[PDB]
Amino acid sequence: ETKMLITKQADWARNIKEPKAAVEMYISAGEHVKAIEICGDHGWVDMLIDIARKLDKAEREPLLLCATYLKKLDSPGYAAETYLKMGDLKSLVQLHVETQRWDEAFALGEKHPEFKDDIYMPYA
Prior knowledge:
By secondary structure, the protein is mainly alpha-helical. Helix content is 77%, strand content 0%.
C-alpha cells in the first residue's frame, strides 16, 4: 500500500515535468524500470550510474537496460563496467569490439578464451 502511494506520487511528479524528484522516488519505490526509462529519456548519466551501481546483481534485466542506456549515451566505459559487474562478459567483449578497444578486448578474451574466439575474428 505504501508502494502504491509512492508510485502515484512519483508518476505525478513526472507528469508536472519535474523528472528529478520523479526519478528520486521511483528509486525509493523499487520501480527501477520506470526510473531507468525516465533517466534514459533525459539522458542523465549521473543518476543512471548511481542506480546501476546500487542495483541488485540479480536484477539482470534492469542492469542490462542500464548498460544499454550507458552505451547509447556517451559512456561506453560505464556500460562496460556495468556489464562486468552483472556478469555478462560475452556482451562485455562485444562492447569492446563495438567501442574499438582492441587491446582491452584481447585481454578480456585472454581471460575468457571463448570470448576471444568469438569476438577476435572481427578484429582479424
